[PDB]
Each structure stands twice: as structure tokens, then as C-alpha cells.
Amino acid sequence: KVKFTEEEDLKLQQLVMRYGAKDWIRISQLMITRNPRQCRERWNNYINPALRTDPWSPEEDMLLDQKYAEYGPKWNKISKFLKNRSDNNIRNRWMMIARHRAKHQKS
């Protein structure tokens, strides 16, 4: 239902190695039920970087505050200043961390 899986993800690494990082249309011939750019989205957010060992540090948290209000939601450009995390990873984590940063009013 949600498409993809580990078996297909492993094939991605092989496909990217053989087809390249632009001929995603070739992969779209084997997988048509997905946006071609999304196949790249996974490669770029899983096998390309090393988004692990916890998120960013508080130093980045307070830095990203400014490194965002200057270049809108250009996470694509922000990930370049923080050599370690990618788009769908930072965006996800930003909204995630914001849920804790924004506190929780009650009484």
C-alpha cells in the first residue's frame, strides 16, 4: 500500500550505480508507481549521507534559527552548511524538534 521496501531499497543502490544519478527514468521503467524524483529522494536521504547518531546539536539548533529566516525553507541550501543531514531528514526533524522547542502549555 505504501510502496517500497528493504528489498527494493537494496536494488536502488545497484540501479544508481549502473544507471547513474540522473537517468532515474531507467529505474522508473521497473518502478512506475512512484515519482522518479522520490527514488532519488531515498538514495539522497539514506545511502548518500549518514543521518544517524542522533539529530543535530543545540549549536546547530540555535544556528538554524538564523540559517532559515534568511533563506526561507531552503533546507536544500542549509544542508550544505551542515555537512551531515539531508532534506527530508532535516525538514522532518525540524518539525519534530519544534514540537518540543515550542513547549507545552497546560497550567
Place this chain on the structure above:
DNA sequence: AAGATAACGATATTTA
């Protein structure tokens, strides 16, 4: 049961 992460589709923007 609730929370967190991941992935796929679409919209908006940019370039051709």
C-alpha cells in the same frame, strides 16, 4: 495506544 520515522504524490518555482 501514542509517538516517531519514512516515502510517495503534488504544488510551486525555476529553467529551458
Place this chain on the structure above:
DNA sequence: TAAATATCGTTATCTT
């Protein structure tokens, strides 16, 4: 103007 690209946004699934 049309097409192509990237990030965004939401839901589903999985883990704790």
C-alpha cells in the same frame, strides 16, 4: 508556456 526538479505534507506502519 510547458516541462522538470526539490521540498513539502500527510498517512501508514512499526517500535517502544
